[PDB]
């Protein structure tokens, strides 16, 4: 315990392994330590480290935070095998500035700390507004199809889909920078909804199982095609493909032949349960040498996030549809939901990613809350609400206290 | 001898160690000075700092260097990593807030 | 009010003129008398015993 070996980072990127005294105060080592790295750099033929104007030499963690000059290396949480960084930090002393007349003072000061509107942002605002507009247009046109079988809904939606997609193409080909692409991506993604309901609305007669087969299919196809030629915004499109594909299977089954919805819902639940274990493998196979590795790593990470998201949506819809406060053994699906939630709540630790772990953790909580609400809306009585209210507040309270205490 | 003598006057425990080895002068990185050469032969001048250490027979040193842009290594430490308890508390608070 | 508005603007340009002169003074005085904690790093520079 009398000494510790650590790697010290120096100028332009050289890493050097050194054996330091574990108890002397850090301020005593920084000077001779600097000499050693300069000697090796000079023999290596590289440019040595130098001071610039006013400043000082400091020893910091890889995060940049400097170590307190009077404390011992063992007093701080530094262990053998860690790495540190030697750095020069410039002087911040300068004259103070004062303004007497409050009007000019407020104006000058307030203009430095905040960002004003500019033409780059202006376009993104408009692009977002047009996207919101058309998803509203398809909504009312769709609501009309739910009461009338005439061609109007498909006819008018078809032309809108064509126009939006047409405009998106010019933007995509003409783009030059990431800002331009953001505008283009927002535009293209907005075309999927009109095109989707335009096909689904074509089959005559009352709406139901037969139309559903067309809708989720073209949706899945469009999402898959877009992902191929765009190669960007991986996570969200992947989620649409998964939820679209599984719904098409259920729609086709129900349309062809199904003894009960519970049968389909139970089948979907089982499919989702096994898919979670397959998710990391699927994501990994879906994906100067350094460029290839980094590109590969982030692409893989993105697919898993999307893949996890799609499954999360399906399980809550199925689970909440399977449970029921009146049908048979009312307690059987409730406890089954509990056992199902426990796996997701526990398995969340197997992934290092923050959003991936958080979404997994959140997926369990929403199911419990959703089940209680379902059992509170129906079979309505003072006992039901009184019990549900208490449960919903106690559930997370116990969870956070056990973690923070 | 004089260092141990001075330590006792300061009330500090003298230098002591166990195992096969020897006592010698070393640099801040642990590299020992040459036992057969003059301090004038070595690059030593007034105001330098040195350490007295026990060199056990088991001692081995890496003696190797590598290059990587320091600006990128520092950035990657935060660009993506594992969860933190502070974030967990924030998430817990939001959930109970959602519950009520 | 028109005379008031002109008078206020004339002062601001004097303020800006004063500020530039002050910055030249800060830059010069710091160059000759640094804060005591920064002196150690300067030992190798030609500024010593100047």
């Amino acid at each position: 315990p009398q000494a510790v070996v650590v790697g010290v980072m120096a100028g332009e990127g050289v890493q050097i392994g050194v054996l330091l005294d574990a108890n002397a105060p850090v301020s005593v080592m920084t000077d001779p330590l600097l000499k050693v790295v300069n000697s090796r750099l000079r023999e290596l033929g590289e440019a040595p480290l130098e001071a610039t104007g006013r400043g000082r030499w400091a020893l910091c963690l890889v995060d940049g935070a400097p170590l307190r000059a009077t404390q011992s290396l063992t007093e701080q949480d530094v262990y053998d095998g860690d790495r540190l960084w030697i750095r020069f930090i410039a002087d911040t002393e300068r004259r103070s500035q004062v303004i007497e007349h409050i009007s000019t003072a407020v104006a000058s000061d307030l203009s430095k700390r905040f960002a004003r509107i500019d033409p780059i942002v202006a376009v993104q605002v408009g692009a977002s507004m047009v996207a919101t507009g058309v998803v509203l247009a398809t909504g009312v046109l769709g609501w009309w199809r739910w009461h009338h079988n005439t061609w109007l809904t498909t006819i008018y939606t078809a032309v809108i889909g064509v126009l939006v997609l047409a405009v998106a193409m010019l933007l995509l080909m003409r783009a030059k920078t990431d800002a331009d692409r953001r505008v283009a991506d927002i535009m293209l993604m907005s075309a999927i909804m009109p095109v989707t309901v335009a096909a689904a609305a074509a089959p005559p007669g009352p709406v139901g199982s037969p139309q559903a087969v067309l809708g989720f299919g073209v949706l899945t196809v469009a999402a898959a095609l877009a992902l191929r030629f765009t190669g960007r915004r991986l996570g969200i499109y992947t989620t649409i493909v998964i939820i679209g594909a599984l719904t098409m299977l259920a729609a086709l089954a129900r349309m062809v032949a199904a003894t009960s919805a519970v049968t389909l819902l139970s089948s979907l639940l089982l499919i989702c349960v096994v898919a979670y274990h397959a998710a990391p493998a699927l994501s990994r196979r879906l994906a100067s040498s350094v460029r290839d590795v980094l590109l590969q790593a982030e692409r893989a990470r993105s697919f898993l996030s999307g893949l996890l998201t799609g499954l999360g949506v399906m399980v809550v819809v199925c689970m909440t549809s399977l449970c029921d406060p009146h049908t048979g053994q009312r307690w059987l699906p409730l406890i089954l939901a509990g056992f199902t939630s426990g796996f997701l709540l526990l398995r969340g630790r197997s992934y290092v990613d923050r959003w991936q772990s958080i979404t997994l953790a959140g997926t369990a909580v929403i199911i419990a809350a959703a089940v209680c609400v379902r059992y509170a809306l129906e079979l309505s009585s003072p006992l039901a609400v009184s019990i549900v209210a208490a449960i919903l507040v106690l559930l997370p309270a116990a969870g956070m206290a056990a973690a923070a205490h | 001898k004089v260092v141990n003598s001075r330590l006792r006057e300061l009330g500090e425990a003298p230098l002591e160690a166990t195992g096969r080895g020897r006592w010698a002068l070393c640099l801040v990185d642990g590299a020992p000075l040459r036992a057969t050469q003059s301090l004038t032969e070595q690059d030593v001048y007034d105001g330098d700092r040195l350490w007295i250490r026990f060199i056990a027979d088991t001692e081995r040193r890496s003696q190797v260097i590598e290059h990587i842009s320091t600006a990128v290594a520092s950035d990657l430490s935060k660009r993506f990593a594992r969860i933190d308890p502070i974030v967990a508390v924030q998430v817990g608070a939001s959930m109970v807030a959602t519950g009520v | 009010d028109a005379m008031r508005a002109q008078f206020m603007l004339m002062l601001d340009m004097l303020r800006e003129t004063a500020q530039e002169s002050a910055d030249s003074m800060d830059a010069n005085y710091r160059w000759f008398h640094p804060a005591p904690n920064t002196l150690a790093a300067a030992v190798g520079s030609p500024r010593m015993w100047e």
């Binding site: 301020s27 000077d31 | 007034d46 105001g47 | 005591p36 904690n37 150690a40 010593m48």
Partner: peptide, 18 residues
Amino acid sequence: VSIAEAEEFAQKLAQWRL
């Protein structure tokens, strides 16, 4: 400045002569 800081500065300066 502290005593340590003074000795630290003094050691750095002692290395040089005319």
